Design a protein around this ligand. Sequence first.
Ligand SMILES: C#CCNC(=O)c1cc(Nc2cc(C3CC3)[nH]n2)nc(N2CCN(C(=O)c3ccc(O[S+](=O)=O)cc3)CC2)n1
Length: 252
Amino acid sequence: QWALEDFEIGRPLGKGKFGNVYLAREKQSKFILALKVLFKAQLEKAGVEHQLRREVEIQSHLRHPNILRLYGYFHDATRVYLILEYAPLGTVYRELQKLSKFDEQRTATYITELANALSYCHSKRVIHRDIKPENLLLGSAGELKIADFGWSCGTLDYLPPEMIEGRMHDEKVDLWSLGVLCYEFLVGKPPFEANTYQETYKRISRVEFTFPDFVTEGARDLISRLLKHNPSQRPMLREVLEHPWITANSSK
Ligand SMILES: C#CCNC(=O)c1cc(Nc2cc(C3CC3)[nH]n2)nc(N2CCN(C(=O)c3ccc(O[S+](=O)=O)cc3)CC2)n1
């Protein structure tokens, strides 16, 4: 229903691996949106042609203030194009490099907007992975918005134990990500970082992490409760919005 000639591309937002994302205005009536171009190259270098083709199928059937929108897509002879919502204030990874580490007010609010988005995703029967600071955009008001979802290998940093052990995984995976994220926001780095898979794999498998002095109790109690090896004993996100440290610092 769309084509490359209903759009006017502007400032290059990001130059990535599978393509580029540009600021674009729908010339029909001047709508500001993010337009990502995925070439057949790289994409056809892997079998991800229909791998991230069902990912777009999941994206469209997804409406949420904290979930980045997918308006549509179309195919070229060289590439494919994705019409996405524009997030004025970049990624959380960028804000994280400038501030190095977040406080408790900001972090508690981020895991709140995330718990809501994940809850909606589970109610809509959607399992998510990959969720990391590189995949989180800020809106006009700093509204957190999750992206990618093409994954709905690489750096294991944000993968749960059951997933790397090649075993079974369910909805409780997103509550491990919530734990790893909350740590990274508070500390500045993921709780299982390293220089290799074999080390990170061991560390993530053994669930071996430590706390800097400044990260406080209530935050420790939440990161700890969230980062249990077994898929159970991890609170359902309904219970994570309830946590005292969360509520005592969050926004709504
Ligand atoms: C500071 C400041 C002001 N704002 C920005 O500086 C700012 C705003 C923005 N607004 C957006 C983009 C989107 C779309 C979902 C893209 N919605 N709202 N995006 C970015 N980015 C996104 C992309 N960036 C990447 O590094 C990349 C990632 C994957 C990727 O995959 S793809 O297969 O090629 C290829 C590149 C890095 C800068 N940066």
